[PDB]
Structure formats: C-alpha cells, structure tokens
C-alpha cells in the first residue's frame, strides 16, 4: 500500500547531451536503472529554449522505450505542471463552467501527460494564491479529478506537490490527489511531524509523502540530508519515521545524485552512483527487517560467487553482512561506500528480494558438479570439458546478472545437466 517515489531528472539521462547543464560529462543512468520498490517515477524535465532537439531522443525514447520497460516492473510515470498552469483555463464570462473547467483538464492531460506516454500529473504549489486563483484551481483540479486520482475509478495518479502547508489551495480539493508530496530537503523527523499537525485539517497521515534530496551539481542551497553515521542521518530518521507513524511513503529528488556532496569536486561534476542511500531508504521506509535484508544480501552473494573471481572481497562482504546492525551497513557491505568501492556497484536488495521466492539449489548442484569436473579435468577428455566449461561461465555470468525469472533458472539447469551428461 505504501509507496515510494522519486524524482528523475530528465537531463541526466544517457539520451540527453548538453540539455540544461554547462557541464560536458556524459550522463551515467538511464531510466532503467532507477531501483526496485520505487512505484511511481516523476519524470522532471526543464529544457531551455533551442534545446528542443537535442531532448527530444529522451522524450522519444521515454514513449517508446523507457515507460513500456517500467509498466513491465509495476512502476507509474508522472509529471508536473506548475500550479500557475492552472489558471489559464479559457472561460467566456466571469468565471468558468462546469463544462469550460472540463474543457481544459483534458487539454492539460493531452498536452503535458498523454502526449508524453505518462500515466499521471502531479501539481506544484509552491506559492500562496489568491482567493481568485483558488476559484479557478478548485474548478481545474475538480475536473481533472473525474479522469485521474483516486476520484476518477483509474490507475493514473494525481498528486500534489509542495514544501509547505498553505491550506487554502488545498483544503477544497484534497480529496482529489492519491496523495500529498512534501518536500521537506534539509530538514529531519521533527518537521515531517509538524507538517502533518498543520495538513491534519485536510489530510489524513497516510496520504501523506514527505521527501528529501541529494545534492544537485552546481547548486547555491544546500541540503544535508545524507550523513554518517546512518541514524544521525536526514534520511533515516525521515525514513524511519514515515514508517513508524503510518505515513504514506516516502520520496528522494534528484535520483541520480545519490551519494554526492556539495564539496568541491562533487558540485561540478557528474559521477555514477551505486545507489545506496536509495536503495535503503526503500527498505527503510517499508520497515524491512534486518533478518530480511541480510537474507537477500547473503543469497546475492551466493549467486555472483560462480562468476566472481574475487574471494577477498567476497568474504570479506559476507562478514560485513553478519556484523552489520542497520539496513545502511546491509547495503554498504555489497555496495560499498561509493560507487566501484564494493563487490558490486548494481546490488539491489528489493530485487533480490522478489528472486528469494526462485528455488537455485538444484542449478547450484549442477554448477558444483561441473566445478568438481574442472578442477579434475586432467581425469577426462578435453574435448567435453571444453563443452563444460563453456557452457558452465555462461550460465554462471548470467546468473550472476541484473535479474531472472523462475523459466530462466530452469534453462540453465537443463543446459548445465546436459554438458554434464556428455
Ligand atoms: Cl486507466
Ligand atoms: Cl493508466
Ligand atoms: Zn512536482
Ligand atoms: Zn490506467
Ligand atoms: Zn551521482
Ligand atoms: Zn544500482
């Protein structure tokens, strides 16, 4: 029921080059790299004037591509649109109709949602509008509210986004949105619950989002919200909290500066990340037990073993997972402090999760047959270790790779035994 969400700019995926940055690196992430357990993605996207063309590869490739791949992993997509959008709406007298407020909601909708291949909208209201703006908002967002959101009977979801807890705009209309995202960078557990107290006339705790960032190339604020040690950080007792007090989720801005500072060498530079704070928030916040995450760890390292030639570091990760006492050190045992500093810079623990439930004792019985028929090769034809071997580091490559499915673990089973049984 929870939910997870966070924002991705669109700009740094490896379809855009030298939109909305001055910086020349290449972009390191594509969609498809965003983590598991993250069921709603808000794609946001600024391109400035004459950047048409060199954004439109990601907006083709997100139609196409990108939001096929996340319906396929249960993931919604949604945008937003500044609340200043709103009271455009066209009208013939002194305020608007029923039928001119619908009139515009789904002009809204084809423009800046179903034109782009999203799911849903959210709104962003980061300012205090007045009495006769909210006349027309009300009427805007009601409308809208008959084709997404939890009024419109649909799937497609209606949110409203803020970093404040301005009732006006919002107290007519609530009911509308799936649920409110707060955006609260900086601050810890003690705001989250303030905010809540303000927004309890209109909005109940499980509807509830709040959200934190990490720090953005090139920015003049500055947001801490990751830290060690793990629990002093924004992020956990945010997390934490959200869980705690049956919250409606969580969200993180800016995916793909994950793990970054605003020290010198971070703020001008684009760097690969190997999701850490990410991929733990998400267990954070569902309240993921450390049994649970040590379990996924351990059947992680289990699996990349057969391929993986460095015992070292493989040992070394297995006792960092049994000595680890948060969610954060599960994680940083595989993963590493940063990206390239662990034994994998891709482990995702709400994916291993899911290949929990995928039986590989008997694939790992034919692998260890076919290990104990190399090291004693000298005792065969070379000629049918060549075919075991063969076959044996592809299975063993691909069954350490991104994921599987149950079929798949069958294959190579069958394609093992049958090396073997020649
Ligand atoms: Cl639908
Ligand atoms: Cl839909
Ligand atoms: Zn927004
Ligand atoms: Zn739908
Ligand atoms: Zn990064
Ligand atoms: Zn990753």
């Given at each position: 029921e929870k939910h997870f969400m966070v924002y991705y700019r669109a700009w740094r995926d490896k379809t855009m080059q030298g939109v909305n940055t001055t910086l020349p690196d290449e972009n390191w992430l594509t969609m498809h790299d965003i983590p598991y357990g993250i069921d709603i993605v808000n794609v946001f996207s600024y391109v400035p004037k004459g950047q048409e063309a060199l954004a439109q590869p990601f907006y083709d490739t997100l139609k196409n591509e990108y939001a096929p791949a996340?319906?396929?992993?249960?993931?919604?997509?949604?945008?937003?649109?500044?609340?200043?959008?709103?009271?455009?709406?066209?009208?013939?007298?002194?305020?608007?109709t029923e039928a001119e407020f619908d009139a515009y909601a789904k002009e809204?909708?084809?423009?800046?949602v179903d034109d782009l291949g999203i799911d849903?909208?959210?709104?962003?209201?980061?300012?205090?509008?007045?009495?006769?703006?909210?006349?027309?908002?009300?009427?805007?967002?009601?409308?809208?509210?008959?084709?997404?959101?939890?009024?419109?009977?649909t799937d497609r979801p209606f949110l409203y986004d803020t970093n404040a807890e301005?009732?006006?705009?919002?107290?007519?209309?609530?009911?509308?949105?799936?649920?409110?995202?707060?955006?609260?960078?900086?601050?810890?557990?003690?705001?989250?619950?303030?905010?809540?107290?303000?927004?309890?006339?209109?909005?109940?705790?499980?509807?509830?989002?709040?959200?934190?960032?990490?720090?953005?190339?090139?920015?003049?604020?500055?947001?801490?919200?990751?830290?060690?040690?793990?629990?002093?950080?924004?992020?956990?007792?945010?997390?934490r909290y959200s869980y705690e007090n049956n919250l409606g989720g969580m969200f993180l801005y800016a995916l793909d500066r994950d793990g970054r500072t605003y020290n010198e060498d971070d703020l001008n530079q684009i760097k690969p990340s190997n999701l850490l704070w990410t991929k733990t928030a998400i267990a954070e916040?569902?309240?993921?037990?450390?049994?649970?995450?040590?379990?996924?760890?351990?059947?992680?390292?289990?699996?990349?073993?057969?391929?993986?030639?460095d015992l070292e570091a493989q040992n070394?990760?297995?006792?960092?997972?049994?000595?680890?006492?948060?969610?954060?050190?599960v994680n940083k045992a595989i993963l590493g402090g940063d990206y390239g500093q662990g034994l994998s810079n891709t482990y995702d623990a709400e994916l291993e999760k899911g290949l929990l439930a995928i039986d590989?004792?008997?694939?790992?019985?034919?692998?260890?047959?076919?290990?104990?028929?190399?090291?004693?090769?000298?005792?065969?034809?070379?000629?049918?270790?060549?075919?075991?071997?063969?076959?044996?580091?592809?299975?063993?490559?691909?069954?350490?790779?991104?994921?599987?499915?149950?079929?798949?673990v069958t294959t190579w089973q069958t394609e093992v035994q049958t090396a073997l049984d020649n």
């Open positions: 996340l319906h396929a992993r249960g993931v919604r997509l949604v945008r937003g649109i500044d609340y200043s959008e709103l009271l455009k709406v066209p009208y013939a007298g002194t305020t608007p809204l909708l084809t423009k800046f849903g909208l959210d709104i962003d209201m980061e300012t205090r509008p007045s009495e006769k703006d909210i006349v027309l908002s009300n009427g805007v967002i009601r409308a809208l509210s008959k084709y997404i959101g939890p009024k419109s009977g301005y009732l006006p705009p919002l107290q007519d209309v609530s009911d509308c949105f799936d649920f409110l995202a707060y955006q609260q960078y900086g601050s810890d557990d003690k705001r989250t619950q303030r905010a809540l107290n303000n927004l309890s006339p209109v909005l109940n705790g499980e509807r509830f989002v709040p959200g934190l960032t990490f720090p953005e190339e090139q920015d003049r604020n500055r947001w801490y919200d990751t830290k060690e040690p793990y629990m002093e950080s924004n992020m956990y007792k945010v997390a916040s569902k309240g993921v037990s450390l049994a649970e995450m040590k379990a996924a760890a351990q059947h992680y390292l289990k699996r990349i073993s057969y391929a993986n030639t070394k990760a297995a006792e960092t997972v049994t000595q680890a006492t948060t969610l954060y050190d590989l004792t008997t694939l790992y019985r034919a692998l260890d047959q076919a290990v104990a028929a190399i090291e004693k090769a000298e005792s065969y034809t070379p000629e049918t270790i060549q075919a075991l071997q063969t076959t044996k580091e592809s299975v063993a490559t691909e069954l350490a790779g991104k994921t599987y499915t149950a079929a798949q």
